[model samples]
Target: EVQLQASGGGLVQPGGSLRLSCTASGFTDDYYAIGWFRQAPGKEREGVSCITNFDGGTYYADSVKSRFTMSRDNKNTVYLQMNSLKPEDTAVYYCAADKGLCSWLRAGGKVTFGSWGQGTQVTVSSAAALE
Candidate 1:
């Protein structure tokens, strides 16, 4: 089983762009596809951005479909870059990994997201990485 971890500076200026990086451990890069999801500030907090899909390319959620980009950074790293920062961008972002190893799913879709990193939160409270 592979593990996922998100490492990023948890701070961003109001007019500055914020980029977060997600790395997957214990698995090869090509075995899976990386995706990004965002939960906006309040309003029941659901996925505001899809931001990634390996087979179909990256697609954003209908609500916040205009502010996200997901791509590969390195051999084992997936990058989530969000530009045009606003106060509304303050939220915990997660990286989801879809591994194609499993085909015997008794439920859900053909693809399965197996590993999720502890979110690297982007809070606008300060100019540095928050806890």
Candidate 2:
């Protein structure tokens, strides 16, 4: 099993950028994919991106295709980088581990998020989110 922990997120002004980290434990392999998801204050969890370093594959959601990137810093940590942020970017972000290894989950078109991080709240604002 793998565990994920997320860090970062306090406040951000308009046109700013932020990096959120997702640290992992219990998995030591070179062929796994980790995913990052976000849920707005009241919305459902949304997929941001997934990184599989084994095959050097990466994917992003259509909404974040231009600004969000997911990468693995090492065997123990994966990162999500978001730039050109806006107030709408405010949300609780999480690091997710897969139950079925993700690649074979095209059956239902929905990826199963297994163990999840505690989640870090990213608050974006111009004046208020700035501070």
- TM-scores, in order shown? 0.66, 0.81
Clash pairs of candidate 2? none
Count clashing residue pairs in model 2: 0
In terms of TM-score, the best-performing candidate is: 2
Off by over 4 Å in 1: 28-31, 48-56, 99-113, 125-131
User: Model 2: per-residue lDDT, tens digit, 1-131?
Assistant: 56787887778876778898888788766666777777777676677777764675787777778988777776578888889887777888777766436531233224564556687888888666424
- Measured with C-alpha atoms, the lDDT of residue 90 in candidate 2 is 88
Give the alpha-carbon lDDT of every model.
0.59, 0.72
Whole-model alpha-carbon lDDT for candidate 2 = 0.72
Candidate 2 Cα outliers beyond 4 Å, as residue runs: 29-31, 99-113
Q: Candidate 1 on 34-116: residue-level lDDT in tens?
A: 56555556633444333333453555555446666667755567776777667777887776666643221212212344655
TM-score for candidate 1, please give it. Answer: 0.66
